[PDB]
Amino acid sequence: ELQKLQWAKQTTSICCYCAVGCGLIVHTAKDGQGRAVNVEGDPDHPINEGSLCPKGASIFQLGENDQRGTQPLYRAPFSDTWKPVTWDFALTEIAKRIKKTRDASFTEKNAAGDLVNRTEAIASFGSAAMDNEECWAYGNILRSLGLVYIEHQARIXHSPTVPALAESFGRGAMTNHWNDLANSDCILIMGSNAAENHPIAFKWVLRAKDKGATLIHVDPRFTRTSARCDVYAPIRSGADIPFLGGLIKYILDNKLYFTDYVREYTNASLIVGEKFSFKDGLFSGYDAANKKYDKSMWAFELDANGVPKRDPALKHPRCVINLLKKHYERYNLDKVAAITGTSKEQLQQVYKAYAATGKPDKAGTIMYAMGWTQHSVGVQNIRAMAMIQLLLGNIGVAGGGVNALRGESNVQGSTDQGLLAHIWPGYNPVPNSKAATLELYNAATPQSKDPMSVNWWQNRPKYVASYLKALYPDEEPAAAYDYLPRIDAGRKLTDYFWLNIFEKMDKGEFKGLFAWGMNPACGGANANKNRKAMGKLEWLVNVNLFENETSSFWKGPGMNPAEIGTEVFFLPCCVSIEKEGSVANSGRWMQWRYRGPKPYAETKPDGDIMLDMFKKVRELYAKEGGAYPAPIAKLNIADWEEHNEFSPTKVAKLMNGYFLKDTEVGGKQFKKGQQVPSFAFLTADGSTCSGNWLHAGSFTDAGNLMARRDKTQTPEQARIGLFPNWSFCWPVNRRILYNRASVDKTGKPWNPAKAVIEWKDGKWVGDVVDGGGDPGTKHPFIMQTHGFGALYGPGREEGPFPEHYEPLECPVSKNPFSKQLHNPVAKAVCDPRYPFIGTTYRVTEHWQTGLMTRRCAWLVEAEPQIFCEISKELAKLRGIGNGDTVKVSSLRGALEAVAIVTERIRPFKIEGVDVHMVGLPWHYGWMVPKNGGDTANLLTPSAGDPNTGIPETKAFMVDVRKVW
Amino acid sequence: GKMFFVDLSRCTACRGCQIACKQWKNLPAEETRNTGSHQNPPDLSYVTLKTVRFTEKSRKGPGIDWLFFPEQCRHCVEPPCKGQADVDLEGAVVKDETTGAVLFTELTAKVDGESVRSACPYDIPRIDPVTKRLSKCDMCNDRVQNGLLPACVKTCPTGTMNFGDEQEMLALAEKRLAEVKKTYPGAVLGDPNDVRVVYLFTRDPKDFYEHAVA
Ligand SMILES: Nc1nc2c(c(=O)[nH]1)N[C@H]1C(S)=C(S)[C@@H](COP(=O)(O)OP(=O)(O)OC[C@H]3O[C@@H](n4cnc5c(=O)[nH]c(N)nc54)[C@H](O)[C@@H]3O)O[C@H]1N2
Ligand SMILES: Nc1nc2c(c(=O)[nH]1)N[C@H]1C(S)=C(S)[C@@H](COP(=O)(O)OP(=O)(O)OC[C@H]3O[C@@H](n4cnc5c(=O)[nH]c(N)nc54)[C@H](O)[C@@H]3O)O[C@H]1N2
Ligand code: SF4
Ligand code: SF4
Ligand code: SF4
Ligand code: SF4
Ligand SMILES: [S]
Ligand SMILES: [W+6]
């Protein structure tokens, strides 16, 4: 016996940091009745096998931390101190601020006369840190109250992926999963620092190398990742599309594509209409006035029945494949080497290694995260990766895929539950003002006349109706549709997003803000503006683990509390290991975790906080009346609680869904009250409810599949590491998406030694088949309208093929690929006093703004202060020595940091001129610790673009000067 | 006896091990500051039994060779620290018969601490300025006796850290050296006959740290 763990109860959990989803074991004193005594890795968990990086390994110090919030705090207008208060007072006075603001601001109809039933005076930020059941309930609370300005983290790092991959494959998700990396023959890490930012992933990456894989890192900087790769290839900031376009040309020229895969499973054979063209950096249909394309000019030639025409011989000049060859012929090794700053020799090595996976029995994977996509062409970067993977036959196969690495532990889930302004749960769009009825809403879904095209989104009416039955089970869907708010069809979508919320806040156009599980005073670009802007709120609610730069912005640097009238409520929530629920990892694994210690002091789970808060609003409306009360009063919250508190289990069951009456579906009989066994059995006629159609299958009559801890595998499952009985992944436990593309038209794997699925005597064996049907009878991309993986993608704002448009403004004046320098569908000053390219990035030991990890002594011990990494070249130019204090300044602000002079950073050669890059971590802030430094977002700009709404935190102009 | 095999060709310098060592023993954090390096704490101390040392070496072409060294007591088969100290008082330093762990006890407060550090060819022992006790890595001996991996080994995500019976681990180190040489031709095992913590270095051990090897 170990004395430390003797007498303690042992429970399982899931790490509260990144989207790898490592398992924990928690030991809690007094057989569960006290505090945590130990937290370490779960040896039985198939992803981490007991391993933890320093963040996961220090969760004990996060949880049993004496700096944590103990009870609600209240800050009165113009006050200069906190005042401790009861939960009763806090939630009561908050409910009144919500009701007072809603009643005064609510608008039933917009100016144009259309019903919108919303308030625009309240906005919410957060959060990927909440459990899936909490994220779901939170969004529905905010929308029942009529909010439209609902955003979180996902805007920055996740939102570019979703339309890039949806256009390409039919879904926005990461295509494979972590364990599957071990099956790859060549791993290209580009726009990712996975060894630092997804550390347990490198378990599987190195096991790939053990079996013969080549590891390639493409990054402007040499990192801890680069140290363990076979090839490090430097790239100039923003030169990614040239890099990837040259690889496409290389693949085509050298005939390294997977011919049969390309002909059968991509849109290579489809005939594009005569109205498509490209010249001098512009596609056809360009409107120079409105900076926009007429995309109908990009449409396919349709046959008699409305189906795009196909030449299987791939000879017609307007075949996608022939147009693709033509488009990328400009991306020769010489031009690409010049702009990327990668040597021709290294380009050839990288291209050769990776394009070799075009062999049917070889697999290549691409790993990317947020680093490379913080600009207006980020969507087209990811498109290029998808296109390469399709040419090589790497989509649907083991060791292949586009592994778009999710950031936070539940950013997949928080996005899945519709905590962005444009989506409901299950990626059903938020209605605009012109979707006047449910039938009109449902009318927007494209149909296919191809009988081999499953076109699964035609089932959308079942999903929207089932969702509406979950919130308002006593109403007809068509009636319930009118309760939830709608955005204006007139306005650009980006008016409702992250960056514009800060803009509107600065104009005094919001009364209240929820800062729920976020630290925007540090995480928002242009921090000086945001910090000032928050002083123009009437009230602010911060729900958080600790006091922070957001909760206490009013006594931040340069701020006078007496001049600031914002009323602030701080509500302390509990840590991950003090509550029960699920989190959805990057591979869509929806994993259940359990309560170890009880909540610290008087902290509460988010579920209890939000539910209590809503109930008080509900009470106020019941006794006072007010603005359009029906959405609030009728909302089904009884399904959300048990024994007087938020119930994770019951919400999860509602999210899965259940039959509201006896129902026949798909030739099966179902009784009232039964759990819906999959989304295939949902209905549009009110027979079924389901809070999220993606969750249908996750919690059935067989019980909670998310809580399965079963490592049982068949040989073929174990060979590639599917672990199908460990937890549950959407959709319906399909671990590798698009897996029908991994077999020929008889159902035989391209690579039998790494089979994903296989037709074996009447059925599919291995993974769950992504789309039912005998071999050869269905197109493999079942969420696409036409059924094919899209090389040519005419739904994208910037054009159907990725094209280099310079994302760097200041150091560049000419585009070597065309006459169009910048993105033609998207005001940088470039003041000569700031000649260096600043960039921000992460280290292994800190998390996000550092709110959490700056409170953990062991992590501060390893990384105690903000630093500034520079080359020997820039150090010599500016007379900076390793470890000197430097001042980094921009048009937006200034800070001090410790200099780190390293050969890991080198100058860029841009248009014949040396241009220096300056690297900062964005993990620091003024509140804690002593001498740590403040946020790198003092320096960053907040001028996004009307397409993405993303600020440029990866390339912004600065100066660096030595201080004494 | 038990042994660690530490394959430094797989290390990402995540510092999982550094943190996990402190979590298991509930060790205090030092006061640190950045002096132009990711390395911190700068050195082993009474309260730091393991730190990851970072070294940058120029190479031809882009990038560097970035060398990482998670430092700990080598648990010597013939421990000089015990040979010293046994001069002043036996029982200050003992060796576990079953595991092969070399263990400092409370009686180290009574011996010549400074002298015991000098006797160490790896410069491992550290002194408490107050109680004069000596501290270092204890092989997580209690965990090992209870059939658990040491904290730093279990936490490691890359397979850098390996632990087990001495014959298995020596067999593993020989097998792995052969495989690793195909990528790093100048790879060597550190003092493999003298110690119970066998590092595989990708090149000259002294590049990783001046006391990497005896
Ligand atoms: N340790 C740790 N891990 C984390 C986090 C954390 O805070 N700390 N945060 C999590 C979250 S929320 C997210 S979204 C992810 C993000 O994960 P990453 O995207 O890996 O994060 P970054 O370090 O910001 O950027 C990755 C790399 O992009 C490189 N880069 C910069 N500009 C370019 C460019 O133009 N082209 C290319 N090819 N590369 C470029 C940077 O040099 C950097 O090495 O990390 C997650 N994991
Ligand atoms: N310059 C620059 N800016 C960036 C980025 C960058 O790379 N560079 N990255 C961007 C990206 S991708 C991201 S993800 C954002 C992140 O920005 P934020 O999310 O604002 O960052 P933090 O608040 O540090 O994230 C962790 C938060 O989770 C909270 N938390 C933890 N557990 C719980 C819980 O159970 N309940 C609740 N309610 N809260 C909990 C912690 O209290 C803390 O506030 O920053 C963005 N900003
Ligand atoms: S932060 Fe990510 S890699 Fe590290 S322990 Fe947690 S889930 Fe695993
Ligand atoms: S935990 Fe493993 S990979 Fe990470 S620094 Fe320690 S030995 Fe290296
Ligand atoms: S490394 Fe030094 S302290 Fe550790 S057993 Fe050997 S001589 Fe003793
Ligand atoms: S074996 Fe135990 S005491 Fe030694 S470094 Fe590892 S965790 Fe620390
Ligand atoms: S995120
Ligand atoms: W993120």
Author numbering:
A (entry chain A): 36 to 861, 869 to 1006
B (entry chain B): 2 to 215
What do the study authors state?
A similar approach was employed to gain further insight into the structural changes occurring when the formate-reduced enzyme is exposed to O2, thus rendering it inactivated. Since the formate-reduced enzyme is more sensitive to O2, formate-treated DvFdhAB crystals were first prepared in the anaerobic chamber (<0.1 ppm of O2). Thus, in the current work, the non-activated enzyme (C845–C872 disulfide bond oxidized) was used to slow down the catalytic reaction, aiming at trapping putative intermediates. The formate-reduced DvFdhAB crystals were flash cooled in liquid nitrogen at different time points after exposure to atmospheric O2.
